[PDB]
Design a binder for this molecule. Structure first.
Ligand SMILES: O=C(O)c1ccccc1O
Length: 203
């Protein structure tokens, strides 16, 4: 989470499930179609709280055109897809999910957006709220197990990949259409909310 931390970091971020703050921010700047950004996350729970889910949501902001033709924040947002998986076999939760749809679902609980994500996602990972549960134990969500041992197991490692989708479409003038986004930038924040077994955010 630290501002001085290298943006091209190999280490998996450690998210503390006791929840001082729990976010991950990333700037989408100076990119071109086909570029990818990867990050691993590990959930730590050194007090062993009784955590049922870890609910992820997306927010965005600070769009800037920076001289590209596109001045729409959402159109730029819509050029990126996210893949989220858990390992500990790799359990795919989200596969190339459009970030604009992921935003409207997880931020707004927009039903039409949720329908687009529901094309691909296993509903086992969907919360009521429109947020995605990313906390698994061997690829199964905690509520699939028959209670919790005295000390709860560590949740599986999370791996995320954001890609700038590469259309390759040209227009009537022979120009690459996604060149409207040239120079554009935008900021994303992925939030992670641990919940109690009653579904409430941990206090
Ligand atoms: O820091 C990153 O590059 C990153 C990449 C994918 C998902 C979340 C992130 O913070």
């Amino acid at each position: 989470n630290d501002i001085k931390s290298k943006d091209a970091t190999f280490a998996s971020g450690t998210l503390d499930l006791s929840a001082k703050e729990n976010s991950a921010s990333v700037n989408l700047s100076n990119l071109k179609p086909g570029d990818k950004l990867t990050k691993d996350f590990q959930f730590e729970n050194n007090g062993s709280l009784a955590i049922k889910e870890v609910l992820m949501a997306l927010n965005y902001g600070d769009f800037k055109a920076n001289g590209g033709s596109n001045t729409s924040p959402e159109d730029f947002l819509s050029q990126f897809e996210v893949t989220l998986l858990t390992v500990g076999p790799k359990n795919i939760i989200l596969d190339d999910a459009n970030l604009k749809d992921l935003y409207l679902m997880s931020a707004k609980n927009d039903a039409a957006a949720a329908e687009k994500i529901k094309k691909q996602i296993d509903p086992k990972f969907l919360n009521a709220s429109g947020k995605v549960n990313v906390a698994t134990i061997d690829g199964k969500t905690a509520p699939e197990y028959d209670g919790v041992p005295k000390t709860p197991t560590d949740f599986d490692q999370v791996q995320m990949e954001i890609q700038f989708k590469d259309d390759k479409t040209k227009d009537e003038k022979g120009l690459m259409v996604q060149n409207k986004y040239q120079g554009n930038s935008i900021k994303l924040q992925f939030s992670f909310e641990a919940t109690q077994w009653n579904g409430l955010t941990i206090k």
